[PDB]
Design a protein around this ligand. Structure first.
Ligand SMILES: O=c1ccn([C@@H]2O[C@H](COP(=O)(O)OP(=O)(O)O)[C@@H](O)[C@H]2O)c(=O)[nH]1
Lengths: 697, 12
């Protein structure tokens, strides 16, 4: 009976909306028994099968729906969503374009296609497709919120106030009606949502993982209660999609090797395949055990593998970022599970026990913002591998082209050896600073830069144009290897003025909001002899920032844009700036470490979210509390003072340059020991039969 | 990875 099957299908659509996915599946299946050739039911069943992670089975049913009904546009668009999740972008594109070819007025298909454009980096096209979707279906939370994120990426602040109001309205309505918020947890920090909303958004996304592990029907795992089977060693497993050329490896790649093999056995669980970089080689070589879970796509089998290794503490380095397999944590194969380093926020999830943070980043009085218990590292939870990756930047020299520390810079592993070969190096007190006078050698270096030559040879030493590192050694440029040559970096390479203050910020532009640019405008207005240095990150955001700046009263030539650079050049060119102005909305995190390694003071204003407080935690560990502002007023005054009181700038820059070495900030050895102590407090607490509690001391 | 929207088809 058609009427019987219809009722089953329609009831299943209702169960689905209510979050009862298992019951939905049951009813779609009953519908198909009654009426086997029921296209709508095949397509709808396939949608919930996708939600349970049964992708191949979903594809089978979409194809069956389309065989039955060749112009079934819903089935094509839904099938594309499945193909997208399987990383078959071409297949998804073919489905969406077919669906729109069938029904040009199909809003969902326009929004789904826009998501491809967005993920491919084609923001103007994503924006155009999202706008079409919204024209067709004005009430469309997914399209609206993804559109708002596109606009954020390119700094389009048109009707920004109304935009924020609507985003919060949408999230409020979705949370009240028990639906999945269209704002992604990782983006929630960018909008004026309450802390309550932000935790709930994270919590509901974590519950998606549960839908996928419930179908597995696995019993709880039995966890070890002693270290006997591991000979007294604590077994730590690090789980990451980012073992390879990714910011996460640029921060912690040294840590697995620095764990004490007497007290710790380290397991690294890669969620990604080998990208062939030295980052991946290193972690694979230095971890006690390296397990490629990208070869075990079934989450049940992967979790089983983790459990069979006997892991005591399992560490989630992804959170809600691309490549995550949080289903592994939802299965709970380890007694203690902790969030660490990779994701700047709470999981909001029952299945994570601890978040590894610090007092500055996550003060006890805001513990309500987190679903995990706070586990404090003693200084900052943040770490970077800069001392290992870029030791060529530990020392520098300059050329007296007239003395400036940041107009024409030379760095190198072999720098001192080269300076010896010279009979006229002046040493200036400010360690100290070697200055090469304007002689024949200095002229040859400067001519290299002016002529855009790749490299020259002086007294047998190779001296490189800093813009040409990839042509000389591609591994040195990515940070996979330490450069061997003496490298030259100049303000002239980036069109920076030789005789003015350079304020920098090298973050992705999405971190900038109107309030932020206004603050920067004010600073520049008060330091007449100054520019702001930003990146084309992405390039299409540049004319927007320029418009809004001009609108705030700044001529165009006060803001200088540079392309995004290879990792090594990005860190090295930070030495050319006087001061970095951190973004209060979401701080530089990796980018903050990058700037400080260069010796560049960073002005920050910590907010209420974890992501807005990281730079202050880095600065506190570094020992520069004078760079941390308590409000916008102080941020502007600190920045203006650094730009106008040149003796104070010299002092503070010297303080950063010295303390990047003497403070614990870049000390991976000390960091690992402190992390090990925290791991133990976690373990002894559990071994004494206790549930997780704040480790804040 | 940007989320997508599944379309539910009602039987009539
Ligand atoms: O010109 C540039 C600018 C940035 N970066 C790097 O690009 C990444 C930016 O990632 P993300 O936005 O996640 O940084 P975070 O938010 O942690 O500061 C970091 O590894 C930077 O070191 C780079 O290699 N070249």
């Amino acid at each position: 009976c058609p009427t019987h099957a219809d009722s089953l299908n329609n009831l299943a659509n209702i169960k689905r909306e209510q979050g009862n996915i298992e019951e939905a599946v049951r009813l779609y299946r009953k519908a198909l028994e009654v009426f086997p050739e029921f296209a709508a039911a095949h397509s709808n069943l396939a949608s919930v099968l996708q939600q349970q992670g049964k992708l191949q089975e979903a594809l089978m049913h979409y194809k069956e729906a389309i065989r039955i009904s060749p112009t079934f546009a819903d089935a094509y668009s839904n099938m594309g969503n499945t193909l997208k999740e399987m990383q078959d972008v071409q297949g998804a594109l073919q489905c969406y374009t077919r669906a729109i070819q069938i029904n040009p007025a199909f809003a969902d298909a326009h929004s789904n296609l826009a998501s491809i454009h967005k993920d491919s980096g084609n923001i103007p096209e994503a924006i155009a497709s999202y706008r079409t979707a919204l024209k067709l279906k004005p009430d469309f939370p997914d399209a609206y919120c993804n559109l708002a994120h596109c606009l954020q990426i390119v700094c389009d602040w048109t009707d920004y106030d109304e935009r924020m109001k609507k985003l919060v309205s949408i999230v409020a309505d979705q949370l009240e009606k028990n639906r999945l918020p269209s704002v992604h947890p990782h983006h929630s920090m960018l909008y004026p949502l309450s802390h309550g909303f932000r935790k709930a958004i994270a919590e509901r996304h974590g519950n998606l993982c549960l839908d996928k592990i419930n179908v597995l029907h696995k019993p709880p795992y039995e966890h070890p209660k002693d270290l006997k089977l591991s000979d007294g060693r604590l077994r730590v497993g690090y789980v990451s999609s980012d073992f390879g050329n990714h910011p996460t490896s640029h921060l912690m790649q040294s840590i697995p090797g620095m764990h004490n093999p007497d007290k710790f056995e380290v397991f690294c669980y890669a969620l990604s395949p080998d990208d062939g970089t030295n980052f991946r080689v290193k972690v694979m070589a230095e971890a006690n055990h390296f397990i490629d879970l990208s070869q075990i796509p079934c989450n049940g089998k992967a979790a089983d593998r983790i459990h069979q290794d006997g892991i005591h503490i399992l560490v989630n380095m992804n959170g809600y970022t691309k490549g995550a397999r949080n289903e592994l944590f939802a299965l709970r194969p380890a007694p203690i599970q902790a969030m660490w380093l990779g994701y700047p926020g709470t999981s909001g999830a029952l299945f994570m026990d601890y978040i590894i943070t610090d007092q500055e980043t996550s003060p006890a009085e805001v513990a309500e913002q987190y679903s995990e218990k706070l586990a404090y590292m003693p200084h900052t939870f943040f770490i970077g591998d800069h001392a290992n990756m870029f030791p060529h930047l530990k020392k520098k020299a300059v050329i007296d082209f007239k003395i400036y520390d940041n107009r024409i810079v030379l760095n190198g592993i072999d720098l001192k050896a080269f300076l010896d070969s010279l009979p006229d190096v002046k040493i200036v007190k400010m360690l100290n600073m070697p200055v090469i006078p304007m002689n024949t050698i200095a002229e040859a270096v400067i001519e290299m830069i002016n002529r855009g030559q790749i490299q020259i040879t002086i007294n047998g030493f190779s001296i490189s144009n800093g813009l040409a590192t990839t042509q000389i050694n591609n591994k040195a440029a990515t940070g996979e290897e330490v450069p061997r040559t003496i490298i030259v970096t100049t303000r002239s390479q980036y069109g920076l003025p030789e005789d003015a203050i350079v304020y920098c910020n090298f973050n992705q532009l999405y971190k900038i909001d109107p309030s932020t640019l206004q603050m920067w405008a004010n600073i520049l207005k008060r330091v007449p002899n100054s520019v702001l240095w930003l990146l084309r990150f992405p390039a299409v955001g540049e004319p927007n920032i320029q418009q809004y700046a001009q609108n705030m009263g700044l001529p165009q030539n006060r803001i200088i844009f540079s392309p995004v650079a290879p990792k090594e050049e990005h860190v090295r060119r930070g030495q050319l700036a006087d001061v970095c102005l951190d973004t209060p909305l979401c701080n530089g995190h990796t980018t903050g470490m990058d700037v400080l390694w260069a010796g560049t003071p960073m002005v920050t204003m910590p907010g209420e979210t974890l992501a807005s407080r990281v730079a202050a935690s880095q600065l506190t560990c570094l020992g520069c509390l004078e760079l941390i502002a308590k409000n916008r007023q102080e941020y502007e005054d600190i920045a203006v003072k650094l730009g106008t009181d040149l003796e104070y700038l010299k002092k503070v820059r010297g303080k950063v340059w010295k303390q990047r070495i003497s403070s614990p900030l870049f000390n991976t050895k000390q960091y690992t020991m402190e992390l090990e102590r925290l791991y133990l407090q976690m373990w002894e607490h559990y071994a004494a039969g206790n549930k997780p509690d704040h480790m804040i001391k | 990875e940007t989320g997508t929207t599944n379309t539910a088809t009602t039987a009539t």
